[PDB]
Amino acid sequence: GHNQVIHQYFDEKNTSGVLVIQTDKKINLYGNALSRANTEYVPASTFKMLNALIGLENQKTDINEIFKWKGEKRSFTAWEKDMTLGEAMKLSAVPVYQELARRIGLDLMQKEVKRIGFGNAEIGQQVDNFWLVGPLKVTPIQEVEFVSQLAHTQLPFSEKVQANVKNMLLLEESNGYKIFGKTGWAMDIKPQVGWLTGWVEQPDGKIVAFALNMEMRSEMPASIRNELLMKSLKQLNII
Numbered sequence: 001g002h003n004q005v006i007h008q009y010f011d012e013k014n015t016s017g018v019l020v021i022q023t024d025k026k027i028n029l030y031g032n033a034l035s036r037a038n039t040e041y042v043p044a045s046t047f048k049m050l051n052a053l054i055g056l057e058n059q060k061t062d063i064n065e066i067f068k069w070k071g072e073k074r075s076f077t078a079w080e081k082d083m084t085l086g087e088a089m090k091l092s093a094v095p096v097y098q099e100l101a102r103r104i105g106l107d108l109m110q111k112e113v114k115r116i117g118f119g120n121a122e123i124g125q126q127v128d129n130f131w132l133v134g135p136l137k138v139t140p141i142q143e144v145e146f147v148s149q150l151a152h153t154q155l156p157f158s159e160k161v162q163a164n165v166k167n168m169l170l171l172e173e174s175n176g177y178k179i180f181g182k183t184g185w186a187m188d189i190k191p192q193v194g195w196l197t198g199w200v201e202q203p204d205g206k207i208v209a210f211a212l213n214m215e216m217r218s219e220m221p222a223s224i225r226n227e228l229l230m231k232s233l234k235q236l237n238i239i
């Protein structure tokens, strides 16, 4: 439950970050830069959860559609293949989600982002990158409320669509526990911002939502986000 131990986890990874925990509409802050919880950052790949919800709800795609890789070089060799929406989610394959965003289009995407009230709810003019370099921004508190609502099926989408998207986010299934979540990493902005937003589904069915946000730098391994989150949830005895 301390609050000092988690501070030493972030102090030692040499980063600046906050961990927002939400249980049954009770928000707690942990980390070593608590004021991050209420400041806006670009959501980067965490926006894929909302992008899928909008795309599925509006029948611009479905969970069986195979997205064709048409041969262009991509940032990771793991992205250079045909894949479903859910595979693209698991690899954070942004080209697939940019194609979806073009299908949705500017009007529908702005109308939906504003109806949901996500972050500042501003998407500007380029429908396929407003979540990576602005103007869309979101606080980690707003991210933990968004993902909490998704876990409880309380977002303003149909329940089948929310359930479809929840099943793309299963990260870990050990001991009757389930961790769902989406990682993020905005590498093309300074300072870089790293995200790890999701929830724990405890064996009794209880839901604990989390939004880890930290400043990033090119040299760290991707798993630094999971390492900080995992040993924080073990310390608070959420797992």
Ligand SMILES: *[C@H](O)[C@H](CO)[C@H]1C[C@H](S[C@H]2CN[C@@H](C(=O)N(C)C)C2)C(C(=O)O)=N1
Pocket (backbone or CB within 6 Å): 043, 044, 045, 046, 076, 078, 091, 092, 093, 094, 132, 183, 184, 185, 186, 222
């Ligand atoms: C894409 O917009 C962005 C989301 O914020 C990507 C970049 C980083 S790294 C990502 C690339 N593919 C995954 C991987 O390790 N491979 C090669 C399959 C991880 C990222 C993230 O993981 O937060 N999302």
